[PDB]
Design a protein around this ligand. Structure first.
Ligand SMILES: [K+]
Ligand SMILES: [K+]
Ligand SMILES: [K+]
Ligand SMILES: [K+]
Ligand SMILES: [Mg+2]
Ligand SMILES: [Mg+2]
Ligand SMILES: [Mg+2]
Ligand SMILES: [Mg+2]
Ligand SMILES: [Mg+2]
Ligand SMILES: [Mg+2]
Ligand SMILES: [Mg+2]
Ligand SMILES: [Mg+2]
Ligand SMILES: [Mg+2]
Ligand SMILES: [Mg+2]
Ligand SMILES: [Mg+2]
Ligand SMILES: [Mg+2]
Ligand SMILES: [Mg+2]
Ligand SMILES: [Mg+2]
Ligand SMILES: [Mg+2]
Ligand SMILES: [Mg+2]
Ligand SMILES: [Mg+2]
Ligand SMILES: [Mg+2]
Ligand SMILES: [Mg+2]
Ligand SMILES: [Mg+2]
Ligand SMILES: [Mg+2]
Ligand SMILES: [Mg+2]
Ligand SMILES: [Mg+2]
Ligand SMILES: [Mg+2]
Ligand SMILES: [Mg+2]
Ligand SMILES: [Mg+2]
Ligand SMILES: [Mg+2]
Ligand SMILES: [Mg+2]
Ligand SMILES: [Mg+2]
Ligand SMILES: [Mg+2]
Ligand SMILES: [Mg+2]
Ligand SMILES: [Mg+2]
Ligand SMILES: [Mg+2]
Ligand SMILES: [Mg+2]
Ligand SMILES: [Mg+2]
Ligand SMILES: [Mg+2]
Ligand SMILES: [Mg+2]
Ligand SMILES: [Mg+2]
Ligand SMILES: [Mg+2]
Ligand SMILES: [Mg+2]
Ligand SMILES: [Mg+2]
Ligand SMILES: [Mg+2]
Ligand SMILES: [Mg+2]
Ligand SMILES: [Mg+2]
Ligand SMILES: [Mg+2]
Ligand SMILES: [Mg+2]
Ligand SMILES: [Mg+2]
Lengths: 88, 73, 101, 119
RNA sequence: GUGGGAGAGGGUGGUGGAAUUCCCGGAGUAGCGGUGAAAUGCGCAGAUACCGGGAGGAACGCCGAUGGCGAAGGCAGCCACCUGGUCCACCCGUGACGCUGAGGCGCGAAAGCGUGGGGAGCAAACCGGAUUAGAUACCCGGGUAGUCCACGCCCUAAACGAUGCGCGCUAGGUCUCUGGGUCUCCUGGGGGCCGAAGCUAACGCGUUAAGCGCGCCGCCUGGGGAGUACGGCCGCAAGGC
């Protein structure tokens, strides 16, 4: 699964400031971790579709958050994409 | 109407999730190996739901019977 | 590293040497999969509710352990090879749910 | 000629026929009877009176082996079960216990169309 | 975000007992089965009924419910692993990042198709027995594809709440599932019943709206012809849109 230590690690890694737990960067990083975990889970067990739907929903949410970041501040958007390695 | 006695009222403090305790789960079974309904046990929804799986575990372990034979018919 | 409980029902007709060998193999398999034992309860032979392996009784063993999850099933198989061992049930440890309190 | 003097009695009662099989305490049969053993041939075998006749006939056949006490075992829901019970109860044979052991499945096999709308 | 909660939610592997069928052995005899009544059928190559053992496939009795979960189809032995959704408490963080959604894409009961496997029970077609004026049926004895599994297709339905999604507002009473709390009770989410105002042609709906409003998509314009023809797209085909 996803233990609390890894969650706190990624949160403190992508935190805009000490105490930030809900900024756009943190949410996108957490969604990216969950998406990679679900993709590794779906490489095997490829007959599971109910989790495939959740994967689609998480991808859509991450895309919407990245679109908001692109609209507001493109610099932090590019920095987030460079740190996470997204969009291919 | 099952006005004889309730298994919970006829018992004290016990663990519902304990699948190894046989002398307590025997009381929750009928004359046959079947599981007593809600009216006989007097438990709640969550209590009955936990009791079902614990009785199934005790059956698989070989402690509780899956079915018995009726006597004095 | 999760906490589990292992129930092992085996042949009650085994003598002390054969039972010692079976328990030795059990402990060896537990060490081979890294299962730290916290406590143990050996209830001995007890009367079964239905005949298992043509035997109305069975010798019970219980082990509260802590081990990595990824090999839990892989451990259970190892415990089913012994012909004397006839029942193996591994259950994740859960807090007791008391009723009529 | 075995001189059992104590055994069991299985009663297989169905809507079409009731058959009584008297066995030893280990299950091996000794004598038996049914509606077809009596003069009844067709549907009259699914009759409580026919079940009584079959039970009494099996009991008298067991008297040849000198049996006194029995353990009755009931299987199947059919017209004539209780009549065979009461027939064996007062027939010279001492009935020690009555046990219903009708084999009920756990929804394993699919029944015929006659027994559908269930599982 | 933190801390908790319930669940047949999904995938994979393993595993349990009852039962059916078959096989082996023991024991045992004149029929079993089946129907309104019968016959086909099976039985002296020893059946049915009984006991023990073995094999195999399929489905999970009681729990179990007017219950729960899921977006829908749908999900019911047990254990483990992987995994999705969801609810509550704290008022912690981001600071309108929202709603809907033509196309597109994916999922999609059963039946059906392909390849391979499996095949106990059930069973289209079919082989018979009855019934009948006739019985290409209902009833009875058999029985293949199939039902099962893996992979790939097929896109249908009384796919039903015959009620698209989201939000706000508008009396309550009662039953229940699930949390939280000062735990007679209050508060939140979910499943039912009765009902204020109101709506409706009526039946009925009524904080789970079919009421009052708003946003967006889909669809309707008499019946038959007809979900047919032609065209296009998709499909191995059946066929579907
Ligand atoms: K004949
Ligand atoms: K329901
Ligand atoms: K074939
Ligand atoms: K409470
Ligand atoms: Mg073994
Ligand atoms: Mg008959
Ligand atoms: Mg499940
Ligand atoms: Mg034989
Ligand atoms: Mg036959
Ligand atoms: Mg035949
Ligand atoms: Mg013949
Ligand atoms: Mg002969
Ligand atoms: Mg048979
Ligand atoms: Mg047998
Ligand atoms: Mg076979
Ligand atoms: Mg039920
Ligand atoms: Mg729901
Ligand atoms: Mg439905
Ligand atoms: Mg605030
Ligand atoms: Mg601020
Ligand atoms: Mg939407
Ligand atoms: Mg669409
Ligand atoms: Mg389909
Ligand atoms: Mg199908
Ligand atoms: Mg096929
Ligand atoms: Mg095939
Ligand atoms: Mg058949
Ligand atoms: Mg037929
Ligand atoms: Mg015919
Ligand atoms: Mg006519
Ligand atoms: Mg004629
Ligand atoms: Mg066959
Ligand atoms: Mg074919
Ligand atoms: Mg419906
Ligand atoms: Mg609809
Ligand atoms: Mg209409
Ligand atoms: Mg409510
Ligand atoms: Mg009403
Ligand atoms: Mg009015
Ligand atoms: Mg009215
Ligand atoms: Mg609605
Ligand atoms: Mg509304
Ligand atoms: Mg017209
Ligand atoms: Mg039309
Ligand atoms: Mg028209
Ligand atoms: Mg059509
Ligand atoms: Mg058409
Ligand atoms: Mg055309
Ligand atoms: Mg074509
Ligand atoms: Mg056709
Ligand atoms: Mg055709």
């Amino acid at each position: 699964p996803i233990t609390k230590e890894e969650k706190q690690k990624v949160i403190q890694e992508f935190a805009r400031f000490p105490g930030d737990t809900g900024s756009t960067e943190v949410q996108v990083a957490l969604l990216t971790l969950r998406i990679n975990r679900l993709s590794e889970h779906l490489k095997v067990h490829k007959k599971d579709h109910h989790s495939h739907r959740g994967l689609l929903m998480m991808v859509g949410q991450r895309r919407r958050l990245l679109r908001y970041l692109q609209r507001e501040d493109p610099e932090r958007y590019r920095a987030l994409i460079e740190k996470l390695g997204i969009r291919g | 109407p099952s006005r004889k006695a309730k298994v919970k009222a006829t018992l004290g403090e016990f663990d519902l999730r304990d699948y190894r305790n046989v002398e307590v789960l025997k009381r929750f079974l009928s004359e046959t190996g079947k599981i007593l309904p809600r009216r006989r046990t007097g438990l709640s929804a969550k209590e009955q739901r936990i009791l079902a799986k614990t009785i199934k575990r005790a059956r698989i372990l070989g402690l509780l019977p899956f079915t018995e034979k009726l006597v004095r018919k | 590293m999760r906490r589990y409980e292992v129930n092992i029902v085996l042949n009650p007709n085994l003598d002390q040497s054969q039972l010692a060998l079976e328990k030795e193999i059990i402990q060896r398999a537990l060490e081979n999969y890294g299962a730290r034992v916290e406590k143990v309860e050996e209830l001995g032979l007890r009367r079964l509710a239905y005949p298992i392996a043509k035997d109305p009784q069975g010798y019970f063993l219980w082990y509260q352990v802590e081990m990595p999850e990824d090999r839990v099933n892989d451990l259970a198989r190892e415990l089913r090879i012994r012909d004397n061992v006839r029942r193996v049930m591994v259950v994740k440890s859960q807090e007791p749910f008391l009723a009529n309190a | 000629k075995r001189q059992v003097a104590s055994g069991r009695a299985y009663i297989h009662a169905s809507y079409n026929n009731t058959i009584v099989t008297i066995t030893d305490p280990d299950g091996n049969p000794i004598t038996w009877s049914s509606g077809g053993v009596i003069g009844y041939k067709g549907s009259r075998k699914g009759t409580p009176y026919a079940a009584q006749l079959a039970a009494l006939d099996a009991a008298k056949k067991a008297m040849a082996y000198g049996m006194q006490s029995v353990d009755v075992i009931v299987r199947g829901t059919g017209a004539g079960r209780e009549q065979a019970i009461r027939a064996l109860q007062a027939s010279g044979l001492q009935v020690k216990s009555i046990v219903d052991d009708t084999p009920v499945p756990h929804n394993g096999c699919r029944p015929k169309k006659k027994f559908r709308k269930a599982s």
